[PDB]
Nucleic acid binder design. Sequence first.
RNA 1: UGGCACCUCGAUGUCGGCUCGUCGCAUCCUGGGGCUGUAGUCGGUCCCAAGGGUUGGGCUGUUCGCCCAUUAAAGCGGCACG
RNA 2: AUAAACGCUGAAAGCAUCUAAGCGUGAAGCCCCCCUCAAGAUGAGAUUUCCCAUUUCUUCGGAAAGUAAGAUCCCUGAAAG
Lengths: 177, 142, 57, 206, 36
Amino acid sequence: SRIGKKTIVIPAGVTVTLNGSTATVKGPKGELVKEFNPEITINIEGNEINVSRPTDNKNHRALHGTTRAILNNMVVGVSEGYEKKLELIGVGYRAQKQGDKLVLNVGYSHPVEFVAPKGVEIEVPANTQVIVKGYNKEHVGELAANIRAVRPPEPYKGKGIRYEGEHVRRKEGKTGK
Amino acid sequence: RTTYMAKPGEVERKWYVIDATGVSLGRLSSEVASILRGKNKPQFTPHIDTGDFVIIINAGKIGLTGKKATDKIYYRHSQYPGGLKSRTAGEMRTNNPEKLLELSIKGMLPKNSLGRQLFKKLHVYGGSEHEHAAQKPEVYEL
Amino acid sequence: WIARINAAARMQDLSYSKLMHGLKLAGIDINRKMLADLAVNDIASFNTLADSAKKAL
Amino acid sequence: TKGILGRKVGMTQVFTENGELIPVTVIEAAQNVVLQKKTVETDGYEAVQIGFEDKRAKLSNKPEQGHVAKADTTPKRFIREFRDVNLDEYEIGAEVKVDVFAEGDIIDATGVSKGKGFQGVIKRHGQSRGPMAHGSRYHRRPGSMGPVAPNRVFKNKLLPGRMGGEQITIQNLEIVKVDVEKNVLLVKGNVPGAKKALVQIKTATK
Amino acid sequence: MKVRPSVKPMCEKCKVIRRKGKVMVICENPKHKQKQ
RNA sequence: UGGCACCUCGAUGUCGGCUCGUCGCAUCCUGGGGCUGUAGUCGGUCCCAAGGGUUGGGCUGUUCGCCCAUUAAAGCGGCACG
RNA sequence: AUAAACGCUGAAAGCAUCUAAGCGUGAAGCCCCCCUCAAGAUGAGAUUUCCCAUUUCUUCGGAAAGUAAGAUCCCUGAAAG
Ligand SMILES: [Mg+2]
Ligand SMILES: [Mg+2]
Ligand SMILES: [Mg+2]
Ligand SMILES: [Mg+2]
Ligand SMILES: [Mg+2]
Ligand SMILES: [Mg+2]
Ligand SMILES: [Mg+2]
Ligand SMILES: [Mg+2]
Ligand SMILES: [Zn+2]
């Protein structure tokens, strides 16, 4: 595992501690705690974290790599944070918010309501632009996916809710003549 | 001619506590059934009950290997047309560990009056405490 | 008889099969009936014979 | 969630404010008293026990007098338990009146149905009868008992037997009128049982 | 989706993967989605 | 549809209907989904799914079938052709 | 809580990947919610209340003979049969 061997440089202001297999990370933006399997081990010093691999067989290699990746994302999210962006395409498609509640008018007979969970926030720069922010990769990704699943893009006009980094496969409504 | 046969109530029966943490269901079941039958004593008599009493604690932490938690099934029939019911081993371990242990132990005891008598000497608890401190049970290692 | 001898020998850190093989190796010709009788009634002589078999192995 | 016990008096009709005409059942519910409260730390579950109708001292025995003497009341003909209630109400020895219900409430009515004796399949189970002519000799009989292969007949093959006298619950009945002075409750519709039968009136569970 | 015993690529962008113990083909063309 | 002749010839009642059903799923309707020669409407095909439901007549001993009028739909098979 | 399915995070395989560790949506179906039976559930459960420690024989075991609380025989019946 090239990933598993890489070093984690701890930024200033964030602290990492180990309670057995459990790991806790604190910093300016929040606190994370997570459990890993005991077969992998972690060293601790002032500003480097190294996860080591006792064995060279398959599952052990995969677990080494994923443990390093999870630690990296956890520390980065505590330190700088994470965000995702969403666009709305279509006539009458509108995004708004009332307090801590996102209201979407996406062509149904009723508006669609969203409330963010703890640690995650929703921001609306414009009526057709949504931003999900938080210090946890999984939760930000899950909430953005849940929002996008309300009205995914469609291939005949492009209407719907999509990421900026999406390429929609486009089709033609009438062909042959 | 001259061979020893034990009489009812003659051989003194003991109380044991066995911890079920991390042991496979079948391995523990085999040992416990052998203890209940009375096959660890030289006074074993096939038509007399000479075994001991067994308490099992932490039955919620019995082990299942492979995909037995989701793929092993227990069935019941009520004797009504179409009345078959199905239940997986893992969610019994979550909900009724005592039933799981009792079914496994019962399957490997003799099928007669004496076997039904021996089934009554087994007590199973899903937590770590039992109600039989007055019987002064003793720790037994598999 | 075999089941009773097995139970008696397991308390001496043996099996029935190992004990019987050892008693064969030592030239001892006591049959199952006498061994089980001795196990139930006179366990000290049973332990003596088990030590003899154990040394034979 | 409220509850009360009563006797079925009869069956009649009333005219509503609009001039409508609806059928009602009359329930008379005098002399209800709280007798006991069951709590989790003593019984395993929470309930309130209610006694309904006064009866003569000749018709009771020492255990009954002992049980009702804790609530300072005379022996009762009927006693039932109500669950899913609030035990912070219901003082021991208190009275329960038809005031607990108001016009427009929706209730559940529990009773024991009228008794029919030994009955056949087409009345007991709503079976279909055979031809009455065209040479037939098959009129009010149960039908085939089953196929040949099992060498036996299955369970739930419906046959004649005793018909009525079962516990029945009817849901979502409306209260039309409450008369406190007469201790009378008027319920739209009908309830199980014959006249003078015991009826439980409870708040609807759905 | 096409459910067949004979899952194999249909163009040069099809890719053969395994998920949950099943062999399958993913592609940009949705007509090429196959599961065994 | 056949082949064989293994139980039953000191008897294992044989078609259709009626009464009463129960089970399988290779699903007729209803529920969830992928692909479409999927713009919409109306459809096609495949995957999951057996919880419930699945019509009254004319002709013929008929099973089947044709026809009339409906229905969300008028499934196919096993049980000594139950 | 799941099926088919759609995803997030993510390595093995510095990328990519719905999968391997870990998460989320998701069916008239499963387990509940609703109605009825149910402790002979010989594993015979729980709560409240009532009566009490009598007299003869026995060699202990135990036996019998008057009762208490409570029920029945018998009789008038139906809302039951
Ligand atoms: Mg089994
Ligand atoms: Mg009657
Ligand atoms: Mg009658
Ligand atoms: Mg006639
Ligand atoms: Mg003959
Ligand atoms: Mg006709
Ligand atoms: Mg129609
Ligand atoms: Mg057939
Ligand atoms: Zn392709």
